[PDB]
Amino acid sequence: ILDENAIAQVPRPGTSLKGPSPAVRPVTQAGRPITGFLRPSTQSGRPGTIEQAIKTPRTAYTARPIASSSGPFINLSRLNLAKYAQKPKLAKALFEYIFHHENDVKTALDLAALSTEHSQYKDWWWKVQIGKCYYRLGLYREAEKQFKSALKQQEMVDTFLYLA
Amino acid sequence: EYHSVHQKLSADMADNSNLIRSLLVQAEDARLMRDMKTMKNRYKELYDLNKDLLNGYKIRCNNHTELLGSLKAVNQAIQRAGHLRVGKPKNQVITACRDAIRSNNINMLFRIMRVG
Amino acid sequence: LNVPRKTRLYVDQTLREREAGTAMHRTFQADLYLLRLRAARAYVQALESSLSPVSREPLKLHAVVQGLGPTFKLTLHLQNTSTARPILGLVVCFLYNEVLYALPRAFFKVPLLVPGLNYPLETFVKSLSDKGISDIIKVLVLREGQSTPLLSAHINMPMSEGL
Amino acid sequence: AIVLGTLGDITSPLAIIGGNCALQGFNHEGNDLFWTVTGDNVHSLALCDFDGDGKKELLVGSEDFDIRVFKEDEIVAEMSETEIITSLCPMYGSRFGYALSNGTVGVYDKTARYWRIKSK
Amino acid sequence: SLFKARDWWSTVLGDKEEFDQGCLCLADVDNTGNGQDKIIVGSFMGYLRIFNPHPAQAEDLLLEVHLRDPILQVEVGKFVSGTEMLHLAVLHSRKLCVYSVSGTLGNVEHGNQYQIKLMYEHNLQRTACNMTYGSFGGVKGRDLICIQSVDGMLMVFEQESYAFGRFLPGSLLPGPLAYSSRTDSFITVSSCHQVESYKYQVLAFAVVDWTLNIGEQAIDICIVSFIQSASSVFVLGERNFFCLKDNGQIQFMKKLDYSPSCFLPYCSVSEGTINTLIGNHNNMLHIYQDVTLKWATQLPHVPVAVRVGCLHDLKGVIVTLSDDGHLQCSYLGTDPSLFQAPKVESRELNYDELDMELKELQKVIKNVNKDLKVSAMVSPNSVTVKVTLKNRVALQKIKLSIYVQPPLVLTGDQFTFEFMAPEMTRTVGFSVYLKGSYSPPELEGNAVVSYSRPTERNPDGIPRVSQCKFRLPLKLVCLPGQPSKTASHKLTIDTNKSPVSLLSLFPGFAVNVMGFRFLGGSQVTLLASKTSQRYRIQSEQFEDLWLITNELIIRLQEYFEKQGIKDFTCSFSGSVPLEEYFELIDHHFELRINGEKLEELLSERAVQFRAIQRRLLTRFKDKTPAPLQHLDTLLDGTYKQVIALADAVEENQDNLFQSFTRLKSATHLVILLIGLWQKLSADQIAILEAAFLPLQQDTQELGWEETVDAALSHLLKTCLSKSSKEQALNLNSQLGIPKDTSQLKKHITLFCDRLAKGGRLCLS
């Protein structure tokens, strides 16, 4: 609700995301018949207001209950990402660690930016990773830019699904 | 460095905007159950985040206007180099400088602006 | 019309049924007997533990949880389901883990339940664990002269999303 | 300031644009096919065939009070108006109508003004 | 059997040993020349085993030799300088050993022995990690060996001695190494996701021939060359599956959704394509025609280093080797088996025992459709209460809580007991004291234990609940104070006895005219009689009368019981108040309406704040600078409004709670005066207490007004009315907040009226 990104507000019926009748197939919302193969990307309809989304079951719009926002091996505040960026063999695994283990998108993006500038913007992997950092920071167009620039380098199924 | 600073500031402001939307939802929740201590705490946190984000906006805008000044300086310099030569050398020098800046070959840029 | 169409699968299945109908009948009757057995078993176990939120002595209760964050609103919708007979002496007792949830009033009387009205009786559950821990909460509705719950309900408390 | 048309010796309608001091051009997919630098902030652009050769040159109105005509790559001519241009419009062969921020609305042949009127 | 890997000669291979890739080799190390291969397996536990399987059996294991140091990547190639016969290479961490499996025969199936001779060895300076073997350069009839190192270095032996050794440029974790012969290149996958090919003569001269940045690091790389038409190089990552050209770019790729462990592009079928088979960590084999799945099978174990070979006249048998020690040759299962219930005429349903159990359970069902003692003791003195509970049967998960009233506060609320042996007593002690200004509606308090009985059916224990109620003394909330002559209002209680000295009824408060002051300032006056037999209770607050009236009646009852006399009344023949009682109701409802207004205003303020916040967030996400247009000022103003409204709602909630407590006291007094004003028994008094005292806290869905109104409308509907027109017009019940209190007051007055005429309450 609190994030609006679709250009068209009331687009033609048939060009936006936002069969058997409910007399045969069970349903979950006003429409949207029950599906096979729940995946954690399923939205299956969307609420209208924050109140409706709160005052409904927590798992009526997602495969998991909704959330408001979507010793230690190495302390992230101690290492100078400007020095691990020089060594790509270390930088790649370190970024994967920061991003997928610790979930620190800002430090991950710092490392990925220093790494991409070290590679003179010629490796699609760092572009895809920066695009992922953006995409889960909220910046979609700034991520679509990196995904397009990565598709220009080398076509991969990964970048295609990311742009999707 | 202007590019990098703007990138870092935009990242931080995206983080804080996501925080603020989460706090808006949480405050609406606390208000729907008339829990006023937690609602007032969400509103305090929102006030503080707005103050910090406004400081971040000021500094970003400032760096961004400086970045626009720098880009205009670069483009006007390429144009001043091209404008010094009449005819077919003009667009030759223009495209040469554009290619020498897209590749960050500054020395070649100045070489083509000097004699080329 | 939209009369459906049946593929080779259907004729093969009907041929198997025509050639082996007796074994199917016998094994389905055996499975039905075992299903009646297990359903009666589970019904008796539920009656023992009194875990049915629907169970002369007419009542119906279900507990709804609302809200993210450390404080959840837990509203018990209770209802007397009878022609015309009120229920005077009843009381609700909550069963929780006193290290994860801080219930202010874990036991309270219920108003005189008039047949046909849904009474929402709400409470404020609060998560105490600094780490996200989701633990069940039981609710027992019972008379004041008896010790066996008239009925019960369960609620899986969601994650805290604390601070 | 942006326009949309066919430049000279380009087989794809470009979405020309004008920024700080540099113009650009993009096809139906967004590939840079045209790029050149101008004097000051571009305020208005239009496509007019100055020179009568069947491929339209683009007319740039700079904040420097000048109106230049740019081919696909080459510059052809420049007429020095008297204030920051605000709008150009061609519908004739080599004639284009221009406006300023003084209030002056006028008309240009190749390199001369047919008429001009200044008002509030 | 469909989509299973049906079993062939299979075995388990040791005592919790451990293998890896390179272990399983499959060729003619025996140099028979007949085509039938022989399995070779060497763990880094030490044992090297060679098998010639036949379709468990004892004579299958050719030999099971044991070497001291561990074993990595057994191979089979022309590793001897002289002849063209296959020799077996064993790579220990710091050792290389070429062997020769020579099998001599005896005149019986098990009289044939097998000798391995160490043709030559090689001390390894660096620690080896894995190796490849091939005819480096354009040599023929020779199989040179390029071993890697754990620290990057690759050392090449020309089949006899230490040819040379060069460090790999920029590698930390050594990946899979292979050698392409159609390009004479060593191809590896460095730690930095780069699949790199080096020309052999380039390394011999020490650089990179070419690189390709795949998305991950590869587990295996298998250059296959049985097709001379179009060469390709297979690279299996840990998330993808690439087939690369010979120049360096992806010919095609598959984005696997599982976790591969091993793969082997074996013999192909079509023109140009290459069949391949990959092994999940989900215990499956997949058989692709270069992108497209042609078959899949459900393996027994997690395959490590699968191979495909002709074993005993059966071409294309799949030999898998787990890392725990299993090993299995197998062939695909291609038998679609009917899905049908098994015909087992022997196995019948035992109707006797099953019917016994079903009769028992059905008896319980059709029957139901037709352990601990608690005690509380209050000290005679912030009074300290002590609660003792004693069990008969052993109980578990005991929780004891105490609930007194809103104003009264406990120093201890909850007490948890775990399991207790039978006949064991437990005592708890807490202290109760007044905290606030208004006096509680009643001094009585409750204490509830919830425990569990462990039973065979449910060991976790069926939950039970039992309670006991204690009675607190006036000495906790009141004090003896000065009396006044006149107060705003008063009531009477006329007993059929003599006026008793108030010093005898209330001895804790030291004439026949007593005065009380509760903690909070409020004062009550109690006047005995001199000529008449009635007691007078007076104050300014209708709430104040309730506690002193209740205590007066209770002390009268107790005293006259101590005198043994049996007839005693507290009639109060007069007028039920019904007018100083309505004003408290109206105050309560005015507070409720004010709260609803405050909340609907807070809603609008919150909506404004959210809208301005979204505007500001939009201005933030935007790159271009722009004036804030004093949006921050509107945000600050809205925030101040929201905080003010929140504080107002808090104060209104507190006022509403105070009003509710005072109303509870008032309605207590009113039920008392109705149960005395008419000779109401205990049943009707309980009905009235249930209808008029429904809840101890208002909530935004159920309040006192609607609940007591529904209860009274129903009580008048089913008991005290005989006209159906009124029953349907006026005597209706709903649970929504009213817009006025006139219906409630009308129903209360009508209740007292229809009680006056002679009506009586009931339930059915």
Side-chain angles (χ1 to χ4, degrees), chain C residues 114, chain E residues 691 706-721 727 730-734 743-744 747-748 751:
Chain C
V114 162
Chain E
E706 317 97 6
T707 313
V708 72
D709 195 0
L712 282 181
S713 290
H714 189 79
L715 281 172
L716 290 157
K717 195 178 189 180
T718 59
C719 292
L720 303 180
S721 158
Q727 264 202 25
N730 313 126
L731 268 58
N732 43 289
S733 53
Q734 294 166 343
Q743 269 284 329
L744 174 57
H747 290 337
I748 300 188
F751 199 98

PDB file of all heavy atoms in Angstrom, chain C residues 114, chain E residues 691 706-721 727 730-734 743-744 747-748 751:
ATOM      1  N   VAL C 114     -26.560 -14.072  26.038  1.00  0.00           N
ATOM      2  CA  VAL C 114     -27.919 -14.130  25.505  1.00  0.00           C
ATOM      3  C   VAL C 114     -27.902 -14.934  24.208  1.00  0.00           C
ATOM      4  O   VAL C 114     -27.035 -14.698  23.355  1.00  0.00           O
ATOM      5  CB  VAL C 114     -28.462 -12.724  25.273  1.00  0.00           C
ATOM      6  CG1 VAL C 114     -29.656 -12.756  24.339  1.00  0.00           C
ATOM      7  CG2 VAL C 114     -28.838 -12.090  26.596  1.00  0.00           C
TER       8      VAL C 114
ATOM      9  N   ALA E 691     -26.649 -10.142  35.127  1.00  0.00           N
ATOM     10  CA  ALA E 691     -27.137  -9.227  34.101  1.00  0.00           C
ATOM     11  C   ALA E 691     -26.593  -7.814  34.261  1.00  0.00           C
ATOM     12  O   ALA E 691     -26.346  -7.138  33.259  1.00  0.00           O
ATOM     13  CB  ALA E 691     -28.666  -9.197  34.114  1.00  0.00           C
ATOM     14  N   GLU E 706     -24.336  -1.570  26.308  1.00  0.00           N
ATOM     15  CA  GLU E 706     -24.954  -2.508  25.377  1.00  0.00           C
ATOM     16  C   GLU E 706     -25.195  -3.857  26.030  1.00  0.00           C
ATOM     17  O   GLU E 706     -26.237  -4.484  25.814  1.00  0.00           O
ATOM     18  CB  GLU E 706     -24.076  -2.686  24.141  1.00  0.00           C
ATOM     19  CG  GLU E 706     -23.507  -1.408  23.598  1.00  0.00           C
ATOM     20  CD  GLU E 706     -22.102  -1.173  24.088  1.00  0.00           C
ATOM     21  OE1 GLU E 706     -21.559  -2.070  24.758  1.00  0.00           O
ATOM     22  OE2 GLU E 706     -21.543  -0.097  23.798  1.00  0.00           O
ATOM     23  N   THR E 707     -24.241  -4.320  26.836  1.00  0.00           N
ATOM     24  CA  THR E 707     -24.342  -5.652  27.416  1.00  0.00           C
ATOM     25  C   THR E 707     -25.467  -5.721  28.439  1.00  0.00           C
ATOM     26  O   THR E 707     -26.306  -6.632  28.396  1.00  0.00           O
ATOM     27  CB  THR E 707     -23.016  -6.042  28.053  1.00  0.00           C
ATOM     28  OG1 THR E 707     -21.949  -5.758  27.143  1.00  0.00           O
ATOM     29  CG2 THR E 707     -23.015  -7.510  28.363  1.00  0.00           C
ATOM     30  N   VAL E 708     -25.505  -4.765  29.369  1.00  0.00           N
ATOM     31  CA  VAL E 708     -26.569  -4.783  30.362  1.00  0.00           C
ATOM     32  C   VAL E 708     -27.914  -4.515  29.704  1.00  0.00           C
ATOM     33  O   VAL E 708     -28.941  -5.042  30.146  1.00  0.00           O
ATOM     34  CB  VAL E 708     -26.274  -3.785  31.496  1.00  0.00           C
ATOM     35  CG1 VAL E 708     -26.439  -2.359  31.016  1.00  0.00           C
ATOM     36  CG2 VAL E 708     -27.182  -4.049  32.674  1.00  0.00           C
ATOM     37  N   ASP E 709     -27.934  -3.745  28.612  1.00  0.00           N
ATOM     38  CA  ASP E 709     -29.188  -3.486  27.918  1.00  0.00           C
ATOM     39  C   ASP E 709     -29.714  -4.747  27.249  1.00  0.00           C
ATOM     40  O   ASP E 709     -30.907  -5.047  27.336  1.00  0.00           O
ATOM     41  CB  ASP E 709     -28.990  -2.373  26.892  1.00  0.00           C
ATOM     42  CG  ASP E 709     -30.296  -1.795  26.398  1.00  0.00           C
ATOM     43  OD1 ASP E 709     -31.363  -2.255  26.854  1.00  0.00           O
ATOM     44  OD2 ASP E 709     -30.256  -0.886  25.543  1.00  0.00           O
ATOM     45  N   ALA E 710     -28.838  -5.492  26.572  1.00  0.00           N
ATOM     46  CA  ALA E 710     -29.247  -6.757  25.974  1.00  0.00           C
ATOM     47  C   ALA E 710     -29.736  -7.727  27.038  1.00  0.00           C
ATOM     48  O   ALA E 710     -30.777  -8.375  26.877  1.00  0.00           O
ATOM     49  CB  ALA E 710     -28.087  -7.365  25.188  1.00  0.00           C
ATOM     50  N   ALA E 711     -28.998  -7.830  28.150  1.00  0.00           N
ATOM     51  CA  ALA E 711     -29.389  -8.757  29.205  1.00  0.00           C
ATOM     52  C   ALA E 711     -30.744  -8.392  29.792  1.00  0.00           C
ATOM     53  O   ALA E 711     -31.586  -9.268  30.014  1.00  0.00           O
ATOM     54  CB  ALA E 711     -28.323  -8.789  30.295  1.00  0.00           C
ATOM     55  N   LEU E 712     -30.986  -7.100  30.027  1.00  0.00           N
ATOM     56  CA  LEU E 712     -32.254  -6.685  30.618  1.00  0.00           C
ATOM     57  C   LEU E 712     -33.402  -6.829  29.631  1.00  0.00           C
ATOM     58  O   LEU E 712     -34.503  -7.241  30.011  1.00  0.00           O
ATOM     59  CB  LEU E 712     -32.154  -5.250  31.116  1.00  0.00           C
ATOM     60  CG  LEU E 712     -31.420  -5.108  32.447  1.00  0.00           C
ATOM     61  CD1 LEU E 712     -31.380  -3.660  32.874  1.00  0.00           C
ATOM     62  CD2 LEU E 712     -32.091  -5.965  33.500  1.00  0.00           C
ATOM     63  N   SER E 713     -33.170  -6.491  28.361  1.00  0.00           N
ATOM     64  CA  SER E 713     -34.198  -6.693  27.351  1.00  0.00           C
ATOM     65  C   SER E 713     -34.578  -8.159  27.253  1.00  0.00           C
ATOM     66  O   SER E 713     -35.761  -8.491  27.144  1.00  0.00           O
ATOM     67  CB  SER E 713     -33.718  -6.172  25.998  1.00  0.00           C
ATOM     68  OG  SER E 713     -33.632  -4.758  25.992  1.00  0.00           O
ATOM     69  N   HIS E 714     -33.598  -9.058  27.331  1.00  0.00           N
ATOM     70  CA  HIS E 714     -33.913 -10.481  27.261  1.00  0.00           C
ATOM     71  C   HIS E 714     -34.637 -10.957  28.515  1.00  0.00           C
ATOM     72  O   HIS E 714     -35.580 -11.754  28.431  1.00  0.00           O
ATOM     73  CB  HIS E 714     -32.640 -11.292  27.043  1.00  0.00           C
ATOM     74  CG  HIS E 714     -32.895 -12.735  26.752  1.00  0.00           C
ATOM     75  ND1 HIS E 714     -33.284 -13.185  25.508  1.00  0.00           N
ATOM     76  CD2 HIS E 714     -32.828 -13.830  27.545  1.00  0.00           C
ATOM     77  CE1 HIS E 714     -33.435 -14.496  25.549  1.00  0.00           C
ATOM     78  NE2 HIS E 714     -33.168 -14.912  26.773  1.00  0.00           N
ATOM     79  N   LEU E 715     -34.203 -10.488  29.688  1.00  0.00           N
ATOM     80  CA  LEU E 715     -34.847 -10.900  30.931  1.00  0.00           C
ATOM     81  C   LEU E 715     -36.295 -10.436  30.981  1.00  0.00           C
ATOM     82  O   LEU E 715     -37.165 -11.147  31.497  1.00  0.00           O
ATOM     83  CB  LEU E 715     -34.069 -10.359  32.129  1.00  0.00           C
ATOM     84  CG  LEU E 715     -32.812 -11.138  32.500  1.00  0.00           C
ATOM     85  CD1 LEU E 715     -32.032 -10.407  33.573  1.00  0.00           C
ATOM     86  CD2 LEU E 715     -33.174 -12.540  32.955  1.00  0.00           C
ATOM     87  N   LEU E 716     -36.574  -9.246  30.447  1.00  0.00           N
ATOM     88  CA  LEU E 716     -37.954  -8.788  30.358  1.00  0.00           C
ATOM     89  C   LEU E 716     -38.711  -9.497  29.244  1.00  0.00           C
ATOM     90  O   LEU E 716     -39.928  -9.682  29.344  1.00  0.00           O
ATOM     91  CB  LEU E 716     -37.992  -7.279  30.140  1.00  0.00           C
ATOM     92  CG  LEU E 716     -37.570  -6.411  31.323  1.00  0.00           C
ATOM     93  CD1 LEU E 716     -37.123  -5.044  30.843  1.00  0.00           C
ATOM     94  CD2 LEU E 716     -38.706  -6.292  32.318  1.00  0.00           C
ATOM     95  N   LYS E 717     -38.009  -9.902  28.187  1.00  0.00           N
ATOM     96  CA  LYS E 717     -38.645 -10.583  27.067  1.00  0.00           C
ATOM     97  C   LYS E 717     -39.174 -11.948  27.482  1.00  0.00           C
ATOM     98  O   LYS E 717     -40.348 -12.262  27.267  1.00  0.00           O
ATOM     99  CB  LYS E 717     -37.636 -10.715  25.926  1.00  0.00           C
ATOM    100  CG  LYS E 717     -38.220 -11.072  24.579  1.00  0.00           C
ATOM    101  CD  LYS E 717     -37.123 -11.128  23.530  1.00  0.00           C
ATOM    102  CE  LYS E 717     -37.691 -11.257  22.129  1.00  0.00           C
ATOM    103  NZ  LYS E 717     -36.613 -11.318  21.103  1.00  0.00           N
ATOM    104  N   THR E 718     -38.321 -12.774  28.083  1.00  0.00           N
ATOM    105  CA  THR E 718     -38.677 -14.159  28.345  1.00  0.00           C
ATOM    106  C   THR E 718     -39.393 -14.371  29.673  1.00  0.00           C
ATOM    107  O   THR E 718     -39.990 -15.435  29.870  1.00  0.00           O
ATOM    108  CB  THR E 718     -37.427 -15.045  28.303  1.00  0.00           C
ATOM    109  OG1 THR E 718     -36.484 -14.590  29.283  1.00  0.00           O
ATOM    110  CG2 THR E 718     -36.789 -15.001  26.928  1.00  0.00           C
ATOM    111  N   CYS E 719     -39.355 -13.405  30.587  1.00  0.00           N
ATOM    112  CA  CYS E 719     -39.917 -13.604  31.917  1.00  0.00           C
ATOM    113  C   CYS E 719     -41.025 -12.622  32.262  1.00  0.00           C
ATOM    114  O   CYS E 719     -42.095 -13.042  32.718  1.00  0.00           O
ATOM    115  CB  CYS E 719     -38.805 -13.514  32.972  1.00  0.00           C
ATOM    116  SG  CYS E 719     -37.619 -14.864  32.907  1.00  0.00           S
ATOM    117  N   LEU E 720     -40.804 -11.326  32.059  1.00  0.00           N
ATOM    118  CA  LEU E 720     -41.664 -10.302  32.636  1.00  0.00           C
ATOM    119  C   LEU E 720     -42.569  -9.608  31.631  1.00  0.00           C
ATOM    120  O   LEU E 720     -43.130  -8.556  31.953  1.00  0.00           O
ATOM    121  CB  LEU E 720     -40.807  -9.256  33.360  1.00  0.00           C
ATOM    122  CG  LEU E 720     -39.889  -9.790  34.459  1.00  0.00           C
ATOM    123  CD1 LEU E 720     -39.099  -8.668  35.097  1.00  0.00           C
ATOM    124  CD2 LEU E 720     -40.686 -10.545  35.506  1.00  0.00           C
ATOM    125  N   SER E 721     -42.737 -10.150  30.430  1.00  0.00           N
ATOM    126  CA  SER E 721     -43.628  -9.559  29.443  1.00  0.00           C
ATOM    127  C   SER E 721     -44.593 -10.608  28.910  1.00  0.00           C
ATOM    128  O   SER E 721     -44.242 -11.781  28.762  1.00  0.00           O
ATOM    129  CB  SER E 721     -42.855  -8.940  28.281  1.00  0.00           C
ATOM    130  OG  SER E 721     -43.678  -8.834  27.135  1.00  0.00           O
ATOM    131  N   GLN E 727     -42.804  -6.927  23.025  1.00  0.00           N
ATOM    132  CA  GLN E 727     -41.684  -7.860  22.952  1.00  0.00           C
ATOM    133  C   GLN E 727     -40.875  -7.662  21.677  1.00  0.00           C
ATOM    134  O   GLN E 727     -39.650  -7.819  21.678  1.00  0.00           O
ATOM    135  CB  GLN E 727     -42.197  -9.296  23.029  1.00  0.00           C
ATOM    136  CG  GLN E 727     -42.150  -9.907  24.409  1.00  0.00           C
ATOM    137  CD  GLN E 727     -42.155 -11.417  24.361  1.00  0.00           C
ATOM    138  OE1 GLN E 727     -41.740 -12.017  23.372  1.00  0.00           O
ATOM    139  NE2 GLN E 727     -42.631 -12.043  25.429  1.00  0.00           N
ATOM    140  N   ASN E 730     -40.064  -2.832  21.547  1.00  0.00           N
ATOM    141  CA  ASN E 730     -39.158  -2.238  22.522  1.00  0.00           C
ATOM    142  C   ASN E 730     -38.141  -3.228  23.075  1.00  0.00           C
ATOM    143  O   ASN E 730     -36.987  -2.855  23.307  1.00  0.00           O
ATOM    144  CB  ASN E 730     -39.953  -1.635  23.682  1.00  0.00           C
ATOM    145  CG  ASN E 730     -41.124  -0.800  23.210  1.00  0.00           C
ATOM    146  OD1 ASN E 730     -42.261  -1.016  23.624  1.00  0.00           O
ATOM    147  ND2 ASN E 730     -40.850   0.161  22.335  1.00  0.00           N
ATOM    148  N   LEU E 731     -38.539  -4.478  23.290  1.00  0.00           N
ATOM    149  CA  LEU E 731     -37.685  -5.460  23.957  1.00  0.00           C
ATOM    150  C   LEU E 731     -36.865  -6.237  22.925  1.00  0.00           C
ATOM    151  O   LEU E 731     -37.043  -7.436  22.703  1.00  0.00           O
ATOM    152  CB  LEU E 731     -38.529  -6.391  24.819  1.00  0.00           C
ATOM    153  CG  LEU E 731     -38.722  -5.996  26.283  1.00  0.00           C
ATOM    154  CD1 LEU E 731     -39.348  -4.622  26.407  1.00  0.00           C
ATOM    155  CD2 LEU E 731     -39.588  -7.024  26.972  1.00  0.00           C
ATOM    156  N   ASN E 732     -35.943  -5.518  22.290  1.00  0.00           N
ATOM    157  CA  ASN E 732     -34.977  -6.107  21.377  1.00  0.00           C
ATOM    158  C   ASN E 732     -33.571  -5.876  21.912  1.00  0.00           C
ATOM    159  O   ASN E 732     -33.330  -4.944  22.685  1.00  0.00           O
ATOM    160  CB  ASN E 732     -35.109  -5.527  19.964  1.00  0.00           C
ATOM    161  CG  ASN E 732     -35.310  -4.027  19.967  1.00  0.00           C
ATOM    162  OD1 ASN E 732     -36.369  -3.533  20.354  1.00  0.00           O
ATOM    163  ND2 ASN E 732     -34.293  -3.293  19.531  1.00  0.00           N
ATOM    164  N   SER E 733     -32.641  -6.732  21.495  1.00  0.00           N
ATOM    165  CA  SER E 733     -31.299  -6.753  22.059  1.00  0.00           C
ATOM    166  C   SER E 733     -30.267  -6.727  20.944  1.00  0.00           C
ATOM    167  O   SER E 733     -30.339  -7.524  20.005  1.00  0.00           O
ATOM    168  CB  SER E 733     -31.097  -7.991  22.937  1.00  0.00           C
ATOM    169  OG  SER E 733     -31.420  -9.173  22.230  1.00  0.00           O
ATOM    170  N   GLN E 734     -29.309  -5.811  21.057  1.00  0.00           N
ATOM    171  CA  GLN E 734     -28.183  -5.720  20.137  1.00  0.00           C
ATOM    172  C   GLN E 734     -26.930  -5.397  20.938  1.00  0.00           C
ATOM    173  O   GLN E 734     -26.999  -5.020  22.110  1.00  0.00           O
ATOM    174  CB  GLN E 734     -28.422  -4.661  19.056  1.00  0.00           C
ATOM    175  CG  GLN E 734     -29.559  -4.985  18.106  1.00  0.00           C
ATOM    176  CD  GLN E 734     -29.989  -3.785  17.290  1.00  0.00           C
ATOM    177  OE1 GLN E 734     -29.673  -2.645  17.627  1.00  0.00           O
ATOM    178  NE2 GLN E 734     -30.717  -4.037  16.208  1.00  0.00           N
ATOM    179  N   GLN E 743     -33.023   4.114  26.353  1.00  0.00           N
ATOM    180  CA  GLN E 743     -33.583   2.768  26.319  1.00  0.00           C
ATOM    181  C   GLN E 743     -33.157   1.961  27.535  1.00  0.00           C
ATOM    182  O   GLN E 743     -33.972   1.246  28.129  1.00  0.00           O
ATOM    183  CB  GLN E 743     -33.165   2.061  25.032  1.00  0.00           C
ATOM    184  CG  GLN E 743     -34.141   2.242  23.889  1.00  0.00           C
ATOM    185  CD  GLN E 743     -35.377   1.383  24.044  1.00  0.00           C
ATOM    186  OE1 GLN E 743     -35.320   0.297  24.615  1.00  0.00           O
ATOM    187  NE2 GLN E 743     -36.502   1.869  23.534  1.00  0.00           N
ATOM    188  N   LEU E 744     -31.884   2.061  27.919  1.00  0.00           N
ATOM    189  CA  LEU E 744     -31.401   1.354  29.100  1.00  0.00           C
ATOM    190  C   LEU E 744     -32.155   1.791  30.350  1.00  0.00           C
ATOM    191  O   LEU E 744     -32.605   0.957  31.143  1.00  0.00           O
ATOM    192  CB  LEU E 744     -29.900   1.586  29.266  1.00  0.00           C
ATOM    193  CG  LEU E 744     -29.259   1.040  30.537  1.00  0.00           C
ATOM    194  CD1 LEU E 744     -29.504  -0.454  30.651  1.00  0.00           C
ATOM    195  CD2 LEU E 744     -27.772   1.346  30.562  1.00  0.00           C
ATOM    196  N   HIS E 747     -35.677   0.538  30.379  1.00  0.00           N
ATOM    197  CA  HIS E 747     -35.748  -0.883  30.690  1.00  0.00           C
ATOM    198  C   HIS E 747     -35.494  -1.149  32.166  1.00  0.00           C
ATOM    199  O   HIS E 747     -36.115  -2.036  32.753  1.00  0.00           O
ATOM    200  CB  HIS E 747     -34.762  -1.664  29.825  1.00  0.00           C
ATOM    201  CG  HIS E 747     -35.150  -1.731  28.382  1.00  0.00           C
ATOM    202  ND1 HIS E 747     -36.448  -1.562  27.954  1.00  0.00           N
ATOM    203  CD2 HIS E 747     -34.412  -1.949  27.269  1.00  0.00           C
ATOM    204  CE1 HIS E 747     -36.493  -1.673  26.639  1.00  0.00           C
ATOM    205  NE2 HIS E 747     -35.272  -1.907  26.198  1.00  0.00           N
ATOM    206  N   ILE E 748     -34.602  -0.381  32.796  1.00  0.00           N
ATOM    207  CA  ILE E 748     -34.336  -0.592  34.218  1.00  0.00           C
ATOM    208  C   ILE E 748     -35.553  -0.196  35.050  1.00  0.00           C
ATOM    209  O   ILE E 748     -35.971  -0.927  35.962  1.00  0.00           O
ATOM    210  CB  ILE E 748     -33.080   0.177  34.665  1.00  0.00           C
ATOM    211  CG1 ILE E 748     -31.860  -0.281  33.874  1.00  0.00           C
ATOM    212  CG2 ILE E 748     -32.814  -0.070  36.126  1.00  0.00           C
ATOM    213  CD1 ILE E 748     -30.561   0.296  34.381  1.00  0.00           C
ATOM    214  N   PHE E 751     -38.134  -2.758  34.615  1.00  0.00           N
ATOM    215  CA  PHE E 751     -37.796  -3.963  35.360  1.00  0.00           C
ATOM    216  C   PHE E 751     -38.220  -3.832  36.813  1.00  0.00           C
ATOM    217  O   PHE E 751     -38.882  -4.719  37.361  1.00  0.00           O
ATOM    218  CB  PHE E 751     -36.295  -4.227  35.254  1.00  0.00           C
ATOM    219  CG  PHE E 751     -35.897  -5.630  35.590  1.00  0.00           C
ATOM    220  CD1 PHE E 751     -35.693  -6.561  34.591  1.00  0.00           C
ATOM    221  CD2 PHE E 751     -35.724  -6.020  36.903  1.00  0.00           C
ATOM    222  CE1 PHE E 751     -35.328  -7.853  34.892  1.00  0.00           C
ATOM    223  CE2 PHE E 751     -35.357  -7.311  37.212  1.00  0.00           C
ATOM    224  CZ  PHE E 751     -35.160  -8.227  36.206  1.00  0.00           C
TER     225      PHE E 751
END
